[PDB]
Amino acid sequence: GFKQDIATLRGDLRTYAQDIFLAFLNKYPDEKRNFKNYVGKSDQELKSMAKFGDHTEKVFNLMMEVADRATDCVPLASDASTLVQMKQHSGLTTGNFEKLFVALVEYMRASGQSFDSQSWDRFGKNLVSALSSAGMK
Ligand code: HEM
Ligand SMILES: CC1=CCC(C(C)C)=CC1
């Protein structure tokens, strides 16, 4: 289920984070603008940029905490508020987070593994709803 999936992802988080974030940027090339430093790079080049591995793993570190603190795939409002309020998310709208979770669910569906892809899909929708409620455009 969802909680086991948190444990699975955490057991190889650096590689899951990079592969899911690459799936996101490759599915939605326009999203690299938020990361202008990732333009004109192949997957292998990106996985050799310090900020790429460091920042992507920190994104998923916090994403797993938010997933872990959720009840029935509904995140804490306090977690939503942190994500809306972070200076690094100044630019963003809910659509950015929706696209990331579409890529994450697709990744899970295409993997050989028994991820509860349906729970992650609900988690993404519930996080987008919570981000809107916490004042993301
Ligand atoms: C649940 C989803 C997400 C979580 C938990 C999250 C978390 C974080 C964290 C912890 C950082 C700080 C990383 C660091 O400074 O090393 C960060 C930075 C950032 N996040 Fe997010 N993030 C999420 C989704 C997104 C999405 C969807 C976008 C854009 C589409 C985005 C854009 C950024 C940007 C531009 C930065 C700063 C630039 C950079 O770190 O290189 N994040 N995020
Ligand atoms: C915060 C943050 C930094 C870098 C990445 C890369 C995987 C593109 C993701 C989000």
mmCIF file of C-alpha atoms and ligand atoms in Angstrom:
data_model
loop_
_atom_site.group_PDB
_atom_site.id
_atom_site.type_symbol
_atom_site.label_atom_id
_atom_site.label_comp_id
_atom_site.label_asym_id
_atom_site.label_seq_id
_atom_site.Cartn_x
_atom_site.Cartn_y
_atom_site.Cartn_z
ATOM 1 C CA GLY A 1 0.000 0.000 0.000
ATOM 2 C CA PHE A 2 0.836 3.713 0.337
ATOM 3 C CA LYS A 3 2.803 3.340 3.630
ATOM 4 C CA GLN A 4 4.873 0.415 2.262
ATOM 5 C CA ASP A 5 5.557 2.483 -0.909
ATOM 6 C CA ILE A 6 6.977 5.294 1.350
ATOM 7 C CA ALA A 7 9.336 2.645 2.839
ATOM 8 C CA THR A 8 10.243 1.299 -0.675
ATOM 9 C CA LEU A 9 11.031 4.805 -2.047
ATOM 10 C CA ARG A 10 13.019 5.724 1.114
ATOM 11 C CA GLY A 11 15.123 2.507 0.725
ATOM 12 C CA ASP A 12 16.630 3.861 -2.564
ATOM 13 C CA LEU A 13 15.478 7.485 -2.364
ATOM 14 C CA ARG A 14 18.351 9.173 -4.318
ATOM 15 C CA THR A 15 17.742 6.930 -7.399
ATOM 16 C CA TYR A 16 13.877 7.053 -7.195
ATOM 17 C CA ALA A 17 13.990 10.859 -6.722
ATOM 18 C CA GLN A 18 16.275 11.429 -9.777
ATOM 19 C CA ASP A 19 14.377 8.945 -12.008
ATOM 20 C CA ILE A 20 10.924 10.355 -11.052
ATOM 21 C CA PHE A 21 12.112 13.982 -11.352
ATOM 22 C CA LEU A 22 13.702 13.192 -14.782
ATOM 23 C CA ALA A 23 10.397 11.531 -15.861
ATOM 24 C CA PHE A 24 8.679 14.822 -14.790
ATOM 25 C CA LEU A 25 11.086 17.176 -16.708
ATOM 26 C CA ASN A 26 11.046 14.887 -19.841
ATOM 27 C CA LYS A 27 7.209 14.522 -19.846
ATOM 28 C CA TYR A 28 6.801 18.350 -19.307
ATOM 29 C CA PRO A 29 9.842 19.980 -20.914
ATOM 30 C CA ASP A 30 8.401 23.527 -20.234
ATOM 31 C CA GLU A 31 8.909 22.770 -16.448
ATOM 32 C CA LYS A 32 12.764 23.033 -16.836
ATOM 33 C CA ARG A 33 12.247 26.883 -17.022
ATOM 34 C CA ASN A 34 11.752 26.795 -13.167
ATOM 35 C CA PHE A 35 15.249 25.168 -13.257
ATOM 36 C CA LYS A 36 16.966 27.170 -16.069
ATOM 37 C CA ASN A 37 20.284 25.440 -15.008
ATOM 38 C CA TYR A 38 18.887 22.041 -16.235
ATOM 39 C CA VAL A 39 18.288 23.218 -19.879
ATOM 40 C CA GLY A 40 20.336 21.530 -22.685
ATOM 41 C CA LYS A 41 21.323 18.574 -20.462
ATOM 42 C CA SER A 42 20.791 14.832 -20.995
ATOM 43 C CA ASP A 43 19.579 12.710 -18.072
ATOM 44 C CA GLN A 44 23.197 11.453 -17.458
ATOM 45 C CA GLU A 45 24.549 15.068 -17.448
ATOM 46 C CA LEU A 46 21.856 16.129 -14.915
ATOM 47 C CA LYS A 47 22.747 13.112 -12.661
ATOM 48 C CA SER A 48 26.314 14.611 -12.617
ATOM 49 C CA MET A 49 25.192 18.140 -11.520
ATOM 50 C CA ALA A 50 25.664 18.527 -7.720
ATOM 51 C CA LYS A 51 22.541 20.722 -7.257
ATOM 52 C CA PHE A 52 20.513 18.196 -9.326
ATOM 53 C CA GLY A 53 21.098 15.180 -7.074
ATOM 54 C CA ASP A 54 21.146 17.268 -3.829
ATOM 55 C CA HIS A 55 18.006 19.383 -4.504
ATOM 56 C CA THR A 56 15.992 16.454 -6.049
ATOM 57 C CA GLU A 57 16.751 14.174 -3.075
ATOM 58 C CA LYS A 58 15.751 17.016 -0.622
ATOM 59 C CA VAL A 59 12.464 17.456 -2.571
ATOM 60 C CA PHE A 60 11.701 13.726 -2.127
ATOM 61 C CA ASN A 61 12.974 13.684 1.481
ATOM 62 C CA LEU A 62 10.208 16.221 2.339
ATOM 63 C CA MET A 63 7.690 14.644 -0.066
ATOM 64 C CA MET A 64 8.072 11.311 1.808
ATOM 65 C CA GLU A 65 7.641 13.133 5.211
ATOM 66 C CA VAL A 66 4.416 14.808 3.929
ATOM 67 C CA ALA A 67 3.218 11.400 2.566
ATOM 68 C CA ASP A 68 4.117 9.784 5.959
ATOM 69 C CA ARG A 69 2.198 12.433 8.008
ATOM 70 C CA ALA A 70 -0.901 12.112 5.734
ATOM 71 C CA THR A 71 -4.098 10.285 6.812
ATOM 72 C CA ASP A 72 -5.703 8.222 3.986
ATOM 73 C CA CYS A 73 -3.502 10.131 1.428
ATOM 74 C CA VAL A 74 -4.691 13.548 2.799
ATOM 75 C CA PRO A 75 -1.667 15.701 3.758
ATOM 76 C CA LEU A 76 -1.549 17.946 6.864
ATOM 77 C CA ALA A 77 -2.672 21.540 6.216
ATOM 78 C CA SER A 78 0.601 22.603 8.032
ATOM 79 C CA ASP A 79 2.600 20.650 5.367
ATOM 80 C CA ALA A 80 0.571 22.363 2.548
ATOM 81 C CA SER A 81 1.259 25.815 4.158
ATOM 82 C CA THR A 82 5.061 25.066 4.373
ATOM 83 C CA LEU A 83 5.087 24.131 0.640
ATOM 84 C CA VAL A 84 3.051 27.282 -0.374
ATOM 85 C CA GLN A 85 5.128 29.594 1.949
ATOM 86 C CA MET A 86 8.666 28.332 0.959
ATOM 87 C CA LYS A 87 10.561 31.185 -0.875
ATOM 88 C CA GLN A 88 11.773 28.585 -3.478
ATOM 89 C CA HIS A 89 8.064 27.991 -4.525
ATOM 90 C CA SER A 90 7.422 31.798 -4.960
ATOM 91 C CA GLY A 91 6.919 31.290 -8.739
ATOM 92 C CA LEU A 92 4.768 28.125 -8.703
ATOM 93 C CA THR A 93 1.066 27.252 -9.254
ATOM 94 C CA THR A 94 -0.791 23.993 -8.367
ATOM 95 C CA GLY A 95 -0.335 22.891 -12.057
ATOM 96 C CA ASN A 96 3.433 22.429 -11.419
ATOM 97 C CA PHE A 97 2.643 19.990 -8.532
ATOM 98 C CA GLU A 98 -0.142 18.266 -10.546
ATOM 99 C CA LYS A 99 2.371 17.563 -13.412
ATOM 100 C CA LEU A 100 4.998 16.182 -10.968
ATOM 101 C CA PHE A 101 2.383 13.724 -9.508
ATOM 102 C CA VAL A 102 1.158 12.708 -13.015
ATOM 103 C CA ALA A 103 4.817 11.835 -13.846
ATOM 104 C CA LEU A 104 5.262 10.040 -10.471
ATOM 105 C CA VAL A 105 2.072 7.918 -10.941
ATOM 106 C CA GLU A 106 3.037 7.099 -14.598
ATOM 107 C CA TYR A 107 6.539 6.087 -13.356
ATOM 108 C CA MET A 108 4.977 3.785 -10.720
ATOM 109 C CA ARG A 109 2.534 2.232 -13.277
ATOM 110 C CA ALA A 110 5.421 1.558 -15.767
ATOM 111 C CA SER A 111 7.764 0.122 -13.043
ATOM 112 C CA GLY A 112 7.885 -3.657 -12.565
ATOM 113 C CA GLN A 113 6.838 -3.122 -8.898
ATOM 114 C CA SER A 114 3.595 -3.358 -6.822
ATOM 115 C CA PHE A 115 3.361 0.413 -6.035
ATOM 116 C CA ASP A 116 -0.165 1.456 -4.954
ATOM 117 C CA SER A 117 -0.280 3.902 -7.933
ATOM 118 C CA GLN A 118 -3.965 4.731 -7.157
ATOM 119 C CA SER A 119 -3.023 6.005 -3.624
ATOM 120 C CA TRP A 120 -0.196 8.213 -5.057
ATOM 121 C CA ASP A 121 -2.708 9.590 -7.612
ATOM 122 C CA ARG A 122 -5.161 10.510 -4.759
ATOM 123 C CA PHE A 123 -2.204 11.845 -2.698
ATOM 124 C CA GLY A 124 -1.222 14.176 -5.613
ATOM 125 C CA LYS A 125 -4.826 15.422 -6.046
ATOM 126 C CA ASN A 126 -5.256 15.880 -2.236
ATOM 127 C CA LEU A 127 -1.921 17.797 -2.023
ATOM 128 C CA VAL A 128 -2.980 20.019 -4.971
ATOM 129 C CA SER A 129 -6.360 20.650 -3.188
ATOM 130 C CA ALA A 130 -4.478 21.450 0.088
ATOM 131 C CA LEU A 131 -1.991 23.778 -1.725
ATOM 132 C CA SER A 132 -4.997 25.692 -3.273
ATOM 133 C CA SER A 133 -6.634 25.872 0.238
ATOM 134 C CA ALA A 134 -3.303 27.200 1.663
ATOM 135 C CA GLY A 135 -3.347 29.927 -1.078
ATOM 136 C CA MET A 136 -1.324 28.616 -4.064
ATOM 137 C CA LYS A 137 -2.717 30.027 -7.384
HETATM 138 C C1 HEM B 1 5.568 17.485 -2.941
HETATM 139 C C2 HEM B 1 6.275 18.180 -3.831
HETATM 140 C C3 HEM B 1 7.477 18.974 -3.518
HETATM 141 C C4 HEM B 1 8.271 19.040 -2.395
HETATM 142 C C5 HEM B 1 8.136 18.191 -1.158
HETATM 143 C C6 HEM B 1 9.231 20.090 -2.621
HETATM 144 C C7 HEM B 1 10.245 20.409 -1.731
HETATM 145 C C8 HEM B 1 11.286 21.283 -2.001
HETATM 146 C C9 HEM B 1 12.411 21.447 -1.189
HETATM 147 C C10 HEM B 1 12.675 20.734 0.117
HETATM 148 C C11 HEM B 1 13.215 22.371 -1.780
HETATM 149 C C12 HEM B 1 14.547 22.835 -1.218
HETATM 150 C C13 HEM B 1 15.667 21.976 -1.839
HETATM 151 C C14 HEM B 1 17.057 22.539 -1.609
HETATM 152 O O1 HEM B 1 17.219 23.772 -1.426
HETATM 153 O O2 HEM B 1 18.052 21.770 -1.638
HETATM 154 C C15 HEM B 1 12.607 22.775 -2.985
HETATM 155 C C16 HEM B 1 13.122 23.713 -3.858
HETATM 156 C C17 HEM B 1 12.527 23.985 -5.055
HETATM 157 N N1 HEM B 1 11.399 23.438 -5.528
HETATM 158 FE FE1 HEM B 1 10.225 22.215 -4.636
HETATM 159 N N2 HEM B 1 9.077 20.616 -3.829
HETATM 160 C C18 HEM B 1 8.016 20.040 -4.406
HETATM 161 C C19 HEM B 1 7.499 20.290 -5.664
HETATM 162 C C20 HEM B 1 8.024 21.228 -6.549
HETATM 163 C C21 HEM B 1 7.536 21.467 -7.855
HETATM 164 C C22 HEM B 1 6.345 20.779 -8.469
HETATM 165 C C23 HEM B 1 8.308 22.455 -8.420
HETATM 166 C C24 HEM B 1 8.203 23.047 -9.771
HETATM 167 C C25 HEM B 1 7.415 22.552 -10.729
HETATM 168 C C26 HEM B 1 9.280 22.807 -7.455
HETATM 169 C C27 HEM B 1 10.217 23.780 -7.663
HETATM 170 C C28 HEM B 1 11.224 24.021 -6.741
HETATM 171 C C29 HEM B 1 12.290 24.960 -7.079
HETATM 172 C C30 HEM B 1 12.441 25.801 -8.345
HETATM 173 C C31 HEM B 1 13.127 24.934 -6.038
HETATM 174 C C32 HEM B 1 14.379 25.784 -5.894
HETATM 175 C C33 HEM B 1 15.424 25.650 -6.985
HETATM 176 C C34 HEM B 1 16.285 24.475 -6.662
HETATM 177 O O3 HEM B 1 16.084 23.800 -5.603
HETATM 178 O O4 HEM B 1 17.205 24.170 -7.462
HETATM 179 N N3 HEM B 1 9.091 22.024 -6.333
HETATM 180 N N4 HEM B 1 11.418 22.102 -3.110
HETATM 181 C C1 LIG B 2 14.100 21.696 -5.604
HETATM 182 C C2 LIG B 2 14.578 20.967 -6.813
HETATM 183 C C3 LIG B 2 15.800 21.080 -7.268
HETATM 184 C C4 LIG B 2 16.313 20.331 -8.448
HETATM 185 C C5 LIG B 2 15.395 19.271 -8.916
HETATM 186 C C6 LIG B 2 15.902 18.435 -10.080
HETATM 187 C C7 LIG B 2 15.585 16.940 -10.048
HETATM 188 C C8 LIG B 2 15.442 18.956 -11.428
HETATM 189 C C9 LIG B 2 14.170 19.144 -8.439
HETATM 190 C C10 LIG B 2 13.558 20.164 -7.538
#
